[PDB]
Design a protein around this ligand. Structure first.
Ligand code: HDD
Ligand code: HDD
Lengths: 726, 726
């Protein structure tokens, strides 16, 4: 027995805040969290406790420490079948990673609609407010490999597998409402341009290189999503604090056959929140797994990520009433023109057991729709339908990928397909064809109907010649980037300018920079001049005379496009760093932890070493991490309680901890003699907005601090940070 | 035509310093750098200029911007074979990454022995000083995926494919002289333990988690390589400044049939040099491709990585004359007892053309030996022989992986093997078996002999029972960790302490830390006490009376195990940051750049924006990067010339540039009014060692700075950096 007698090796099977316990597989951490999909996976789950170590053939292994050899110092013998099996499996562990979105993090949950949508869709999972549909959701980046970092500047993926009673429905979206390109034929072109360059495979997880901006400068259709990626949208605080969109216009079909155009939205319950770039870039080095960890730990804490599903709904006769083409995925539908209507809510409440088996092997594909839903002629969606079935043949080893447990439907599935690599199902049907008499033609077709019917495509009208040709209605590239730009706050605009500037500064060929600046001058001259200034470029008089693009159906801004314009913050699930000293004033800490617990805010107690310290009243305080081990990048605010401040007053890591949080605009709270730290951040004796300070942490100290946290960051501090050396 | 009329899209086909030009595939950058392997690859190289865009079947494409559809706003048609071919190929681009060493960077070069070694080996590539052997070298980390970061704390791989006239020889080594484990049966257990943990797949590129130190604490055989991993050996400055080792004892076999035991060594011509931890960890964020980048650019500069091959040689009759077992791969051979004898030199002088085709698909395997070389009963080596063949069947799609162009021998190869997936060779032999009369038994066996003879194994004697048993001679675990500890300088010992301390602070279960500390007390109680203090752990009296382990055949220490104890630094290929202002003193800059070119030291001119600035004499200075875009992490030293210093005196990024470089112990030179920056780094008016300063950048000023660069870092500055907030 190698476990410790005190049993401290096993985490408790109950919700615990991040860092209190070792993380564990979901069925062990929360065995009583169940749904119909989790239960169906029990047949393939494998335990371990009280079992013998065997080969894959069931043979008990006596000595798992040594190869078989001719003498204890002799050659290894080919007849060691236990070695060779163990090494063979190891030698073939890896499978191809996803072509795009290879880096991702996933969890189980459930979905439930608010009310029956049977008036607009016959889709069964939206027909009754009491119908609960299990889900599996994978969040992702786009460009980086499976081993790349979480907090890069990138688009994020948001893929939801609905295990419906009438088929698997995959909603395969991103965290922005549009994509970079218009036609699927260009997808390898765009992806090759953004991916690491083919001679040397640099850089990983970054669009800040020549070939990406080269493609953008020559393809202005890309400009809208590029705007989004250069904003703080491209660097989310977590997957819980981002939006989701299906991007394409789809169709809803009701029992009477009426089609309604629809676009899908996920609204985060935790609000919209993003990092700032210096923080996001450094965090890819201090913790490349930050988003993966934060997701797992929130679920282990009970901080279940929640999202409200919503629809923008457009009648068929309104197809042409907007300036933009509904079928153009580089165009958004402003919520000011078509509101998002609440449909239901999704809760992610259990982690997987084995990342490889459940996350890496999961297969999402937007062609996986159910009766009540249908496609449109969006030329990007159209080509997606081919790719997501095709790519699985190599990634997941063949055509039986639906038999891998995480991908199996929970509803019945029967047909006349047979064979293929690693076929699990053993068909007893006398027939493998239809029409057949020898099994009385079963399984049988089902006619279309209002529920439990067969799938039939909406009989939309088609008219035109066979052409490789872009619809002229698509050939407008600058109005929607402008609408986005004007909808941002001034500090969000600053960050957009700084994103473009930082990225173009790493383009080596200067003529590429100049061509991207010229495209910006077609969007907004304020934006283009600000970027040009940082690049040492001067706009020509002709460029200064570029007429701006028209408004979007009269709109000159839409505050739903901004992260922060309308407050939607939420402190539940946020984390505060508490910086300890060797004789902490316990009255401060008790007030701090009481206020944080009331709002569901977590705390990390940090010191210069691990182990424990003792407060003034003798209370023993366990240390979560060092100052260097858990930098301010990983928390939302910093609190410094009173006590023996001289212990850390001249500690470089303690001082830098506050300087980093200050530069990154986070709230900071100083109690008693901890107010001496204002000098390291150059805060005058009069104080300033964003620095909570008082004689002690009792009173309004923590309400000021929690109000600041509900506002996410202290945007008013931005003029002051450029003098801070951090 | 989309290129710029001035041709600045294309880099010059001549050696150019890093940053000067865009990087390029090796055949375009250096068309005249040739060897036999590079030349043999011309049959599969594909150009591009002046060729039509086609399908894979050779059909010319007219519109590569659109899918085929029924009307320009209609559905995509299944008959668009151009779309489906292009998407199909994209959908299947990825192949399994390597199970280990998935992250790596490679280059072409050549090798040449100094003299004939026919007295000790009949290996043909070592027979003649005028015999040139082309090579392909891949450097790697171990734990992370192909998309993980370069400057992690890990072991590094160093793999060399020799394309000899008598077969491919692969020398597949690492950058430390031992491995973690003794018997290959344990390799899946160790690797699984160091890799991301199976439930959530965290952490990437790090051994700082519970399962790794759990294994270590339970398997003391691992302590020796762990010590190397926790030293600055784990974080190399670049692949050019690290050693290589084969680790295993092999045999040399001469024409008389005499066996000599040998261990292989690579000695870097650039010397040994490593980062510091805070620097290395931060650099995985600011540039996760730092090592890949530095290697490519050094070769484009003509700054070819060079390595001397050396042998430790031991007569067969001396097999048992050491305190350790020569066949134990957790033991090193001290150079003080067996010197490394120089054999030849290897030069890396051309980058690949396509990273995937040459680097990702390259297959290295230590079973690939040639006549004149042989194996030993090293139980780790013995199991490696199985794995490197087996793993390619899935990783490279089958048994013809030797036909992938990078892997092809340059010498003849003929046998009776046939078929298999993607077979390229078309065999005309009437017979696919031997013995055969119908082709007069060709191709035929060759008897062993002095040159050009068939491979025969050394007929070593084997005596023993079939057993799964570790040799008792392997049962010592602490003498070699001690030897290594005592061989380090005081500041390398400090960095080892901080490496163990940092990593154990990330282990969530405290009993694992305590168990690792107890292991450390069997090596050195000063190391154990210093790590325990940072963990809040108090060693018991029992632990304090653990007897130290004996030394190694009388050796207490061996300075060759230190990175820095013996000076070996070379400044050629290093890089200096030069921080500009808007009116630089041209006399300063002229003298700086003149002295750096004399030593082959590169420079990047940094400013607060892109573009150009003008010197005091009107000289236009082009800016290479911003202060933030090329942080001090990426340079070896910082020079601040005199000028309009008020322009950057209050720039937070400019002051931080110096503070970061200061903390990471790098040389700093300050001319004229730049000396006012001393206050930011808290240097007294009278100065200190490591800070170069004068009225101007002439005189001895550049000599002083270059002397500091030859010493790599200012170790004496360590006591001062703790009080620095950076
Ligand atoms: C025609 C090619 C093509 C095009 C135009 C798109 N995609 Fe895609 N996408 C793929 C081809 C693809 C793929 C190559 O088939 C992937 C990679 C691995 C896989 O299974 O599917 C994929 C993966 C993938 C994933 C990750 C699913 C997971 O977690 O496993 C998401 C979230 C998206 N895509 C979302 C989008 C969105 C929102 C798009 C624009 C509206 C989009 N893709 C356009
Ligand atoms: C029995 C299993 C096993 C054991 C005990 C080892 N390795 Fe290994 N090694 C492999 C199984 C393996 C592998 C799984 O076969 C790899 C991964 C993919 C491949 O082609 O070979 C590999 C890759 C690999 C590479 C990367 C090659 C490349 O650049 O493509 C290097 C440098 C090494 N190894 C070096 C070592 C050293 C120095 C070891 C100890 C002395 C060692 N390996 C033990």
């Amino acid at each position: 027995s190698l476990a410790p007698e005190d049993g401290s090796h096993r985490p408790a099977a109950e919700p615990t805040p991040p860092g209190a316990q070792p993380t564990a597989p979901g069925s062990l951490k929360a065995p009583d969290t169940r749904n119909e999909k989790l239960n169906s996976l029990e047949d393939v789950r494998k335990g371990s406790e009280n079992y013998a170590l065997t080969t894959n053939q069931g043979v008990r292994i006596a000595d798992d420490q040594n190869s078989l050899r001719a003498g204890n110092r002799g050659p290894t013998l080919l007849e060691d079948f236990i070695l060779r099996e163990k090494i063979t499996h190891f030698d073939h562990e890896r499978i191809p990673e996803r072509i795009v979105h290879a880096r991702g993090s996933a969890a189980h949950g459930y979905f439930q609609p608010y009310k029956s949508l049977s008036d607009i869709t016959k889709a069964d999972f939206l027909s009754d407010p009491n119908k609960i549909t299990p889900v599996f959701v994978r969040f992702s980046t786009v460009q980086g490999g499976a081993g790349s970092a979480d907090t890069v500047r990138d688009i994020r993926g948001f893929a939801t597998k609905f295990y419906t009673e009438e088929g698997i429905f995959d909603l395969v979206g991103n965290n922005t409402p549009i994509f970079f390109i218009q036609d699927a034929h260009k997808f390898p072109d765009f992806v090759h341009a953004v991916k690491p360059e083919p001679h040397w495979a640099i850089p990983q997880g970054q669009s800040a290189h020549d070939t990406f901006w080269d493609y953008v400068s020559l393809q202005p259709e890309t400009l809208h999503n590029v705007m989004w990626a250069m904003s703080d949208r491209g660097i989310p605080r977590s997957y819980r604090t981002m939006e989701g969109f299906g991007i394409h216009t789809f169709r809803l079909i009701n029992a009477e056959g009426k089609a309604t155009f629809v676009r899908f939205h996920w609204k985060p319950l935790a609000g919209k929140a993003s990092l700032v770039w210096d923080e996001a870039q450094k965090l890819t080095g201090r913790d490349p797994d930050f988003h993966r960890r934060e997701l797992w730990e929130a679920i282990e804490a009970g901080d279940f990520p929640e999202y409200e599903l919503g629809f923008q709904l457009i009648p068929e006769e309104d197809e042409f009433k907007f300036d933009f083409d509904l079928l153009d995925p580089t165009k958004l539908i402003p919520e000011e023109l078509v509101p998002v209507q609440r449909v239901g809510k999704m809760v992610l409440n259990r982690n997987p057991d084995n990342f490889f088996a459940e996350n890496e092997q999961a297969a999402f594909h937007p062609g996986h729709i159910v009766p009540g839903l249908d496609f449109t002629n969006d030329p990007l969606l159209q080509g997606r339908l081919f790719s997501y079935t095709d790519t699985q043949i190599s990634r997941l080893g063949g055509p039986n990928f639906h038999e891998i447990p995480i991908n199996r439907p929970t509803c019945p599935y029967h047909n006349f397909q047979r064979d293929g690599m690693h076929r699990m199902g053993i068909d007893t049907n006398p027939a493998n064809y239809e029409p057949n008499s020898i099994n009385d033609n079963w399984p049988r077709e089902t006619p279309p109907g209002p529920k439990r019917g067969g799938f039939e495509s909406y009989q939309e009208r088609v008219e035109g010649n066979k052409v490789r040709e872009r619809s002229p209605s698509f050939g407008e590239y600058y109005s929607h980037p402008r609408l986005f730009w004007l909808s941002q706050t001034p500090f969000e605009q600053r960050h957009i300018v700084d994103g473009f500037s930082f990225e173009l500064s790493k383009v080596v060929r200067p003529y590429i920079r100049e061509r991207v600046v010229d495209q910006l001058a077609h969007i907004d001259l304020t934006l283009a001049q600000a970027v040009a200034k940082n690049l040492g470029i001067e706009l020509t008089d002709d460029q200064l005379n570029i007429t701006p693009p028209p408004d979007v159906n009269g709109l000159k801004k839409d505050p739903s496009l901004s992260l922060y314009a309308i407050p939607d913050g939420d402190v539940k699930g946020r984390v505060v760093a508490i910086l300890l000293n060797d004789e902490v004033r316990s009255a401060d800490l008790l007030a701090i932890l009481k206020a944080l617990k009331a709002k569901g805010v977590h705390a990390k107690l940090l010191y210069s070493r691990m182990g424990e310290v003792t407060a003034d009243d003798g209370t023993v305080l366990p240390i979560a991490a060092t100052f260097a081990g858990a930098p301010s990048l990983t928390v939302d605010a910093v609190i410094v309680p009173c006590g023996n401040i001289a212990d850390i007053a001249d500690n470089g890591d303690a001082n830098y901890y506050l300087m980093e949080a200050y530069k990154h605009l986070k709230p900071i709270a100083l109690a008693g003699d901890a107010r001496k730290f204002k000098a390291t951040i150059k805060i005058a004796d009069q104080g300033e907005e964003g620095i909570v300070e008082a004689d002690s942490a009792d009173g309004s100290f923590m309400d000021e601090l929690l109000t600041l946290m509900a506002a996410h960051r202290v945007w008013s501090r931005i003029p002051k940070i450029d003098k801070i050396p951090a």
